[PDB]
């Protein structure tokens, strides 16, 4: 039980660590979703600067 509880604690430790990493990565995912979109928009703002400059 102590070892199983220890495993629960170690696994919970990992669970929490992964959760923290999950959230960090997910938060990065979200900032990156925002960046991938802002960047796709920049891909267009810059493409537009090229089109405008081309004109």
């Amino acid at each position: 039980l102590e070892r199983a509880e220890e495993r629960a604690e170690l696994s919970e430790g990992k669970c929490a660590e992964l959760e923290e990493e999950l959230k960090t990565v997910t938060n990065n995912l979200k900032s990156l979703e925002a960046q991938a979109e802002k960047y796709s928009q920049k891909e267009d703002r810059y493409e537009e600067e090229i089109k405008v400059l081309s004109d």
Partner: protein, 375 residues
Amino acid sequence: DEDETTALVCDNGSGLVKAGFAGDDAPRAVFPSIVGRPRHQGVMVGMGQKDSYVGDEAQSKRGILTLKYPIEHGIITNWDDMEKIWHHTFYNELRVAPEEHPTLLTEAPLNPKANREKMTQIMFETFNVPAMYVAIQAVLSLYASGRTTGIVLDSGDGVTHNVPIYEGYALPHAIMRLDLAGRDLTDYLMKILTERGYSFVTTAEREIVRDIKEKLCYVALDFENEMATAASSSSLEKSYELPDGQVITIGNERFRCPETLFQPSFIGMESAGIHETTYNSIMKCDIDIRKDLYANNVMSGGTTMYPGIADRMQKEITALAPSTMKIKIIAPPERKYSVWIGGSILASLSTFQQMWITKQEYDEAGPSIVHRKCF
């Protein structure tokens, strides 16, 4: 127990000494820089009991010990305790005999020469090492990270050195030595946990608070948003189990402590903050250097592991930086371990084999040799 005369590597901080042998990618063990002493009178006969305990012994028997660290913001001031820490490290756990191996130690480039001279002296005079080198922590994180350029920000337990490196060169006029680290963050947390009804003063209590910070705290990408939320709702509290079965919950203190890195005024320090010192190290470099340092904000040591810090530091520099410039943080998993790792890499480089001080050179040159051979 090694089958080659590989250099030994030991990263001696105010927190823990990371140690192992050159060529690995990790220390064999981390040896807290602690020497403990009993603070009570023995009653029972035949109990063994020593005058002092070292490293993990000091923490394991801490219930009746007073625990002290020999290192003050990167400089060893208590050499008796470091000989015990080093002896234990080699003798019991690394299973190392320094007499047969070169040894590489690490240090902030900004610390008093007394420390680099004395570390050179003890490995040659107490441990009989055949060779020595003391390395720069900015350099060591950059090697571990695969970089030659960047601002290295330690924000460690002891000191923050804030050192810009370009193409492998130091840019010393742009260095911001800062007297702010995890040891101060911990004291701040003890005072704000006192506000919550949990008074932490004695050694067992100090070690608990350092454990609370390490498991519960974060910086926050945006302090004020987390501040206002954590101060308004229990949904931001996180619990911690105290060793006696009691528990503590922590609210906005969870980030108010780490925040001192960005706001040193929290502990009475007069400082720009880690994001401004990082910024100023970029800003003070030449105009054709600035772009490369903006793109290479390099992490070193611990606290760089706090949630929101890699994103926050990049935002805080961006907010101060000129437009056009692209600002990026290099925050590898080799975090909290990159200085030791850099030592392994450096000790092992073919280009570094002539950088080692040999025993014969040391004996002829005297202790001041570290100034001519290391840095």
